[PDB]
Design a protein around this ligand. Structure first.
Ligand code: HEM
Ligand code: HEM
Ligand code: HEM
Ligand code: HEM
Ligand code: HEM
Ligand code: HEM
Ligand code: HEM
Ligand code: HEM
Ligand SMILES: [C-]#N
Ligand SMILES: [C-]#N
Ligand SMILES: [C-]#N
Ligand SMILES: [C-]#N
Ligand SMILES: [C-]#N
Ligand SMILES: [C-]#N
Ligand SMILES: [C-]#N
Ligand SMILES: [C-]#N
Ligand SMILES: [Ca+2]
Ligand SMILES: [Ca+2]
Ligand SMILES: [Ca+2]
Ligand SMILES: [Zn+2]
Lengths: 177, 141, 148, 168, 142, 151, 54, 148, 141, 142, 151, 112
């Protein structure tokens, strides 16, 4: 959190090596199997941990809407369904996931779910999930595992084209239905 | 004599002034405010669009149409055919109204006065006058 | 299914990836495609453009025309958050289209369809639904006082 | 969080915030209401000890067109005048890590001071040595062993590059 | 899909977003290269002259940049078929004589099509890119 | 080394060069600029025009020559963007020198001329142009490209 | 940056929530985690002395 | 050893510690010293300033002259990041010096030397090398077209 | 009658407008833009330096020379000898050109119009007119 | 070195940088004083009237400030020899009668020449300062 | 104490006073201002001029009088900068009162006059001048300096 | 602090040797090739400090840092440090002649 308040001197799409360290690296080189930092931080275990998107993970949280949709506060689940990690391009993990929402719309409860696909990028610790062929007004989700672990994430429901934030969402792992 | 580098420069600076929507409207309105301030003899021509009230929707829509057409011509500066066609189209839209051909010089005057306020770069006055004239020449008979 | 503020903001944002340049090439290409589609589906309308030389689609006259359209649409979209000005410009465009006899509302529905067919081919993450919902609004104003 | 100190002042630290002069730290008289300006840890003269060397990789922004390499600054001498103790005057050497092929290394001789309250090592060109580089190290990590350094122009204090220094 | 006038326009715009800002450009290039050599490591022998053994060498950087420049000309002229044909002929001449299996071109394609969405991160179309790459590569092969 | 095309010199050059390529039809601008430079070079030194016969310079609006203007402009862009990394820049410029050596008839005087033309054009198109830095750097760049020429 | 509107209270936890300042410690649970109803220990007791230094 | 951007930025920065005031006293003193040095080393040049009273160095004419020089140099240095304008002003100054017969390039090398001798006496952390490398640039332009 | 406090004030405000290099150029250029806008009869005098195009290098260099000389005179305001010498030097540079002596009043007009835009303080119009006149008087015959 | 017209200008500029911004001015003064009294503690007896026993007393602050003001007049007039001579005569009169060994003036000098570079921290010239101080001190002594 | 020359009053006074001394020739300005004030005082109350005979007031451009104007201006500067510390200010002002007591012929009316002159001049030179605060504070300062005068 | 026995006629002062660069070839790992700098502590009055640029190696088994003159730098001094105190932080150093290995002086080195 402190490191977030501090910011960095690196450009966008760059990865700062140490915590205090001044070296920057392209985020296309992060966890690709090659030591690019003078201190090898871009290949460190904490950095390259793949458990935020370990399939089977079910992140749950409360979605608070303030744009796009007129929903009251409600549960949302990001359910990791699969991951692909090319051995020729380890910089990113291609994630497939199901996004479920418990809506108490009309007196009774109803599940609103959709299938989605995207990626987890190690450098900025970010999971991007856009709706698989879902023109049907399902908004994308962007989660930042910025809480120091692989268990909690600060998310947003966003429009894919503009990255406009329509909802605030904070998921934690909990996990087991 | 609006050559390659001239029209390239004008294209760039025009992108600076008109390409950002947040100050495109201010740009148009200020152009008109200046034009009408320094040449009120001109205002009679714009009774159709409330030229006496530039803060009105009629005139706003007008100024928008203007800047749009100017965008088209500046953008066609390198396509001689389509340029000539567009400039004759502008001609058709102006010939019906008894417009003193030296009013175009005044228009250019206001344009050059207002432009640097929306340019992060230094106004290339030569390029702008040359290209503006190769446009106005075509608009006039 | 109205044209929401979100829809308008969306369209305004995505808009700079569809043509939009200091050069007219993309406008000509894309608008040109829109009309190829229109004429393909409503060939009767192709006659209405003899004045701008549709028969010679490489002519400066037709290019300049396409650019005029593209820029007209640009003007409309840029006015999405200035409803009064949008209304005046909409009226202006409407009268411009009333002067042309043979232009019908059906042709407008047609061009809406062709736009919706062309735009998603030139840019990804183009919100088609938003486009449709907003175009309906624009066209229904331009094309009223025209003949079904 | 910062502090409400003026130029030429430094915080005393502690429970009740107080600002005092650069020139009052570690001079044997307690000027802080809590005496912190004479604390044994505050007045640690270790960051200016002979043989102290601080190194780290430099991101340059001017002056040098080389890519990120190490810089090392080594204290080679010091003197703390007994009548003026709030400064430790130091002689240092700035050197750059260069490739196995270069074999014509660049070395800059510096002189300056360490200021206790500022927690600052400030270095400039040695007497008659071509005003090329100066160094500003700030020991703000809470110990005598890490510092935020800038390689600057001695005149303008213009930042040429930055390195995160670590004591080796 | 196939390389339409339209989908060519799309590819062109996306390539603008990915390549035109010379910041991480050498890194973009090198990422493409690490991926390629990861798929078909035997191809490194073709690049001895330009230090294919070490993709961080200045000589190989210069190389990968030359490449991306050529590819840039190719993409930039997708809407100018005469110029496109010209650049493709040029590249073809630069590549003839070198024994390059289709294998390696597929490696290049796969590399590009994985680095691209990592670069853009957002709105991109792998089908359009597949089509247009196929066109350019066919042009370079013959 | 420093002073002649220094770090800040390179930063200035890159920053100012970046201004030209703002929009999506940067290719159009590169072709226009390259065509201008080259045809101007062919006018100033007429013996040069024959050297571009294989790229169809006689039809400068034509495909092949357009693609070629893209070639030079992209080489120039590349070399400017490579000024951060002197070794890589040197390698790329060396490759260019090799390429211009394989074209007999190309002489150093041509590079002197194109240097003049280049700076003259850049003074116009660029709104912000630090002639000292630009000339400092391009002396070295064009120098290295023309370094392997027979004449 | 504040996580809540100018006059609201951050319930905190791994699932954040904002609740009106007027609803904190009124004996009715408004946070989903009941945070507004567990702060409720007044630091001041009759007889307490606090000494402040300038 | 050219005049780098760093050198120019350096000179521009250090420049406000060498004279630079709402008062001319420092300019007169320092420029005056520069010329004392120049005349000491190239006494033949002293004759060129009879028009301003080199002969009475406390005179208003000579003071005003020194100030004119100082401000001329100021103008030059301030234009270091405006190469076109610098070029025009450089040309102007050059012609101003061509009107004066007896002014040679050798005298300019001389004044460069005397500047380099005087400046480090009035301000510490004055980059002498940078000054030399940049002065060479300025003078070689001013003093070309003058007798070698 | 440009007394001690007058010249002190003018010195200070001048330091505000001209002492900062980041807005010295804007200052000069805007001074000229104003002067030529409100008195275009004057532009003829500056054909030697492209007065018709203030965005040109010629005119930029000119305006720079101007502001420099103005700096010299304002700075010599307290040294009567060197002042008189400098002002007669300026005179020599202006007497050859047929300059309407009331153009100086207009120059001062533009100066006072542009100045407050570059002053963090309130323009002391009295001090400025008094000192400007004690300068112009000397420049004129 | 010696007190040139030029080196006087240098000293003058540096003194501007050190003294002219009344923030830490009383602290600058007092630092000078702590150093002086540290070197020659027997000199404190000369300052009984002005509380030399406690350099943090308001009376001694007032004093040290009076001092730095005088010294400021002296430095400020290094380029105006008539005025300089005047101020130096004035200070001399203020100091005559007081038995002040050269010893103490050397203490003052050493104090000033250690606090000054601590204040400026950057570009300063101890030789110029040595020369000009020597001039001023000689002026105050006779 | 508060209200009359309060904390904020002192802050205003210091902040506004700081504006005058921007450049390196602050000495020139101090001498000019002091000379102005003093000669104006000698004009307003002619019996005063004799009191400055030992500082050569008859040659106000002269060395001795210039150095003296620096003396007063620096005393004024010092007293303004000392307004943060009331006790130290009081001590310094007391020393000044002592010094003006040792000059027989100096009267309180002179200080009243110089107060008027001072405020009138400051209204001109300072662009931002809060008369209420300035007068509030200088009433006390000049008051304390003139407090040990016989007449 | 160095006790000298030749070469330098100065009294005991500090010596500092600083590693400025290194390279450990992956095909020949029993040596670490280093670039270093030997510098001497000198008085406040000297202001003309002497600095010697060195290159050499660290040998693991020997526990030895061996340094000699950098390429083309006047064979004045070499350094031999033996890390035999049981840690990486203290060493017995000699400042020697690069040719003869003749001992000019000794200092007990400590890592700072
Ligand atoms: C090259 C600069 C100019 C451009 C690009 C331009 C372009 C345009 C355009 C696009 C329209 C809209 C026509 C329509 O919507 O039917 C228009 C209308 C008009 N223009 Fe211009 N014009 C220019 C200069 C001028 C000048 C100098 C005048 C003389 C004051 C002028 C007077 C008018 C008038 C009176 C109208 C129509 C008013 C109305 O619709 O009520 N224009 N022009
Ligand atoms: C999608 C909404 C449309 C927009 C924004 C639009 C825009 C324009 C513009 C800018 C012009 C040029 C007017 C001028 O500059 O004087 C024009 C003219 C014209 N429009 Fe459209 N148009 C639209 C739809 C249509 C439709 C569906 C038709 C039916 C085929 C149509 C038929 C025509 C015709 C025949 C002209 C005459 C052009 C000429 O003669 O130069 N328009 N339109
Ligand atoms: C359509 C994708 C490709 C493009 C756009 C491309 C373009 C280029 C370019 C611009 C050069 C530099 C030639 C010069 O400047 O003289 C080059 C050289 C070369 N290419 Fe490619 N290439 C592509 C795919 C490949 C493939 C898949 C291979 C097989 C690994 C390959 C093998 C080579 C080799 C061996 C060289 C010369 C190496 C050297 O410079 O020593 N290329 N190509
Ligand atoms: C302004 C710096 C210059 C740059 C960056 C540049 C760049 C290039 C490039 C990239 C090529 C393409 C080679 C290839 O792709 O195989 C080329 C070819 C060529 N260059 Fe240049 N060049 C420059 C100056 C010159 C000069 C001054 C001349 C003398 C006329 C010249 C003569 C040629 C010729 C004759 C070709 C052959 C083109 C062909 O046959 O395809 N170049 N240059
Ligand atoms: C250091 C670069 C120099 C600069 C910036 C400079 C600047 C100036 C300026 C501003 C003037 C006044 C011209 C006018 O206002 O009409 C002037 C005049 C003059 N300069 Fe220089 N100067 C330089 C070097 C020299 C050199 C080396 C000499 C050879 C001794 C020289 C000889 C003269 C002479 C003879 C005049 C005529 C003054 C008169 O009216 O008597 N200058 N210079
Ligand atoms: C007190 C305000 C003024 C100052 C300080 C001033 C100063 C100067 C200076 C320094 C020059 C350059 C001369 C040279 O280097 O050869 C100059 C030239 C000139 N001045 Fe002024 N001037 C002032 C007012 C005016 C007035 C009011 C006019 C009438 C519009 C005027 C007309 C000119 C012209 C026409 C030139 C020469 C143009 C050329 O060289 O092509 N000046 N003046
Ligand atoms: C060149 C450095 C010095 C300067 C500029 C200086 C200046 C001054 C000043 C301004 C005063 C106040 C006079 C008054 O207002 O009555 C003063 C008084 C005095 N000075 Fe110095 N002084 C210097 C060095 C010294 C030295 C080294 C000593 C020996 C310790 C010394 C001994 C004294 C004493 C004892 C007083 C009387 C304080 C009192 O009771 O009012 N001064 N000097
Ligand atoms: C405006 C507030 C004033 C201040 C801050 C001030 C300050 C000073 C100072 C610092 C001195 C130098 C004393 C020394 O160092 O020996 C001085 C001297 C003197 N003051 Fe003032 N003064 C003020 C007002 C006045 C006025 C109103 C009078 C009435 C004429 C006056 C009469 C004198 C005289 C006669 C001297 C003797 C100077 C000499 O002969 O050396 N002062 N003043
Ligand atoms: C044009 N209106
Ligand atoms: C529609 N044209
Ligand atoms: C590809 N080379
Ligand atoms: C060059 N081609
Ligand atoms: C030159 N003066
Ligand atoms: C004056 N110009
Ligand atoms: C002073 N004493
Ligand atoms: C009083 N002076
Ligand atoms: Ca890596
Ligand atoms: Ca203390
Ligand atoms: Ca509650
Ligand atoms: Zn709470």
């Amino acid at each position: 959190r402190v490191s977030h308040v501090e910011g960095t001197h690196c450009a966008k799409k760059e990865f700062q090596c140490g915590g205090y360290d001044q070296e920057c690296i392209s985020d296309l080189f992060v966890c690709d199997g090659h030591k690019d930092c003078h201190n090898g931080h871009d290949e460190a275990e904490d950095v390259c941990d793949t458990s935020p998107v370990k399939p089977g993970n079910i992140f749950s949280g409360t979605s608070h809407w303030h744009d796009c949709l007129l929903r009251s506060d409600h549960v949302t689940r990001v359910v990791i369904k699969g991951t692909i990690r090319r051995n020729y391009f380890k910089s990113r993990i291609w994630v497939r996931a199901q996004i479920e929402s418990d809506l108490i719309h009309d007196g009774k409860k109803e599940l609103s779910d959709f299938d989605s696909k995207g990626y987890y990028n190690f450098a900025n610790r970010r999971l991007v999930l856009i709706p698989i062929a879902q023109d049907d007004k399902h908004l994308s989700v962007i989660c930042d595992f910025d809480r120091g672990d692989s268990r909690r994430a600060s998310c947003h429901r966003v429009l894919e084209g503009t990255l406009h934030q329509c909802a605030n969402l904070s998921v934690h792992l909990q996990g087991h239905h | 004599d609006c050559s390659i580098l001239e029209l390239l420069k004008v294209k760039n600076q025009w992108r600076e002034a008109f390409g950002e929507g947040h100050h495109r409207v201010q740009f148009g309105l200020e152009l008109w405010k200046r034009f009408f301030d320094t040449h009120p003899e001109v205002k009679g021509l714009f009774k159709g669009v409330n030229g006496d009230n530039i803060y009105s929707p009629e005139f706003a829509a007008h100024a928008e149409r203007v800047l749009s057409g100017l965008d088209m011509t500046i953008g066609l500066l390198d396509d001689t055919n389509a340029f000539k066609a567009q400039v004759t189209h502008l001609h058709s839209q102006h010939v019906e109204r008894s417009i003193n051909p030296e009013f175009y010089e005044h228009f250019l005057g206001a344009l050059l006065h207002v432009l640097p306020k929306y340019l992060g770069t230094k106004l290339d006055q030569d390029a702008w006058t040359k290209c503006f004239h190769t446009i106005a020449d075509g608009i006039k008979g | 299914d109205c044209c929401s503020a979100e829809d308008r903001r969306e369209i305004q944002h995505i808009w700079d990836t569809v043509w939009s340049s200091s050069f007219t090439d993309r406008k000509v290409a894309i608008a040109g495609a829109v009309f190829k589609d229109l004429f393909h589906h409503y060939p009767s309308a192709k006659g209405l453009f003899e004045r701008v030389k549709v028969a010679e689609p490489d002519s400066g006259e037709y290019h300049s025309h396409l650019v005029r359209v593209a820029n007209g649409l640009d003007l409309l979209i840029n006015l999405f958050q200035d409803t009064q000005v949008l209304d005046k410009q909409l009226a202006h465009l409407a009268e411009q289209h009333i002067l042309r006899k043979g232009v019908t509302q059906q042709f407008f529905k047609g061009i809406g369809e062709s736009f919706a067919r062309v735009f998603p081919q030139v840019s990804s993450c183009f919100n088609l639904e938003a486009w449709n919902r907003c175009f309906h609004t624009l066209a229904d104003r331009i094309s009223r006082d025209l003949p079904h | 969080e910062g502090d409400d100190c003026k130029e030429h002042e430094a915080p005393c630290g502690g429970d009740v915030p107080q600002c005092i002069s650069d020139l009052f730290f570690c001079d044997g008289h307690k000027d802080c209401k809590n005496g912190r300006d004479e604390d044994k840890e505050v007045c640690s003269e270790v960051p200016a000890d002979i043989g102290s060397s601080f190194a780290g990789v430099v991101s340059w922004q001017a002056c040098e067109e080389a890519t990120p390499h190490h810089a090392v600054v080594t204290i080679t001498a010091n003197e703390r005048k007994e009548f003026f103790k709030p400064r430790i005057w130091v002689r240092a050497i700035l050197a750059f890590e260069e490739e196995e092929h270069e074999h014509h290394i660049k070395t800059f001789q510096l002189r300056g001071y360490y200021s206790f309250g500022d927690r600052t090592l400030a270095l400039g060109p040695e007497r008659g040595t071509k005003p090329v580089y100066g160094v500003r190290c700030h020991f703000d990590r809470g110990d005598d062993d890490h510092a935020d350094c800038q390689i600057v122009n001695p005149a303008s204090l213009f930042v040429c590059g930055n390195f995160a220094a670590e004591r080796h | 899909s196939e390389c339409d006038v339209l989908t060519r326009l799309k590819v062109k715009a996306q390539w603008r977003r990915a390549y035109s800002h010379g910041h991480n450009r050498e890194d973009f290039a090198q990422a493409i290269w690490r991926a390629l050599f990861a798929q078909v490591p035997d191809s490194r022998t073709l690049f001895k002259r330009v230090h294919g053994h070490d993709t961080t060498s200045p000589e190989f950087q210069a190389h990968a940049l030359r490449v991306l420049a050529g590819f840039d000309i190719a993409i930039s002229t997708l809407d100018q078929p005469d110029a496109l044909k010209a650049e493709l002929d040029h590249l073809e001449k630069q590549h003839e004589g070198r024994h390059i299996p289709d294998n390696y071109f597929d490696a290049f394609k796969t590399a590009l099509l994985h680095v691209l969405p990592a670069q853009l991160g957002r709105c991109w179309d792998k089908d359009a890119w597949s089509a247009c790459f196929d066109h350019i590569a066919h042009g370079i092969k013959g | 080394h420093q002073f002649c095309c220094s770090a800040e010199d390179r930063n200035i050059v890159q920053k100012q060069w970046s201004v030209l390529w703002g929009d999506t039809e940067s290719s159009k601008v590169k072709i226009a600029f390259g065509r201008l430079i080259l045809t101007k070079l062919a006018k100033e030194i007429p013996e040069v025009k024959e050297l571009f016969n294989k790229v169809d310079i006689d039809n400068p609006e034509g495909g092949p020559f357009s693609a070629h203007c893209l070639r030079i402009l992209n080489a120039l862009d590349m070399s400017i963007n490579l000024m951060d990394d002197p070794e890589a820049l040197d390698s790329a410029l060396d490759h260019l020198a090799d390429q211009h050596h394989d074209r007999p008839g190309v002489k150093k005087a041509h590079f002197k001329k194109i240097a003049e033309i280049l700076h003259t054009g850049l003074q116009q198109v660029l709104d912000d142009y630090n002639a000292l830095s630009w000339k400092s750097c391009f002396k070295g760049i064009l120098g290295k490209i023309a370094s392997k020429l027979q004449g | 940056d504040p996580s809540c509107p100018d006059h609201e209270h951050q319930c905190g936890g791994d699932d954040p929530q904002c609740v009106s300042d007027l609803l904190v410690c009124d004996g009715i649970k408004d946070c989903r985690n009941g945070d507004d109803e567990s702060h409720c220990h007044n630091p001041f007791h009759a007889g307490d002395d606090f000494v402040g230094d300038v």
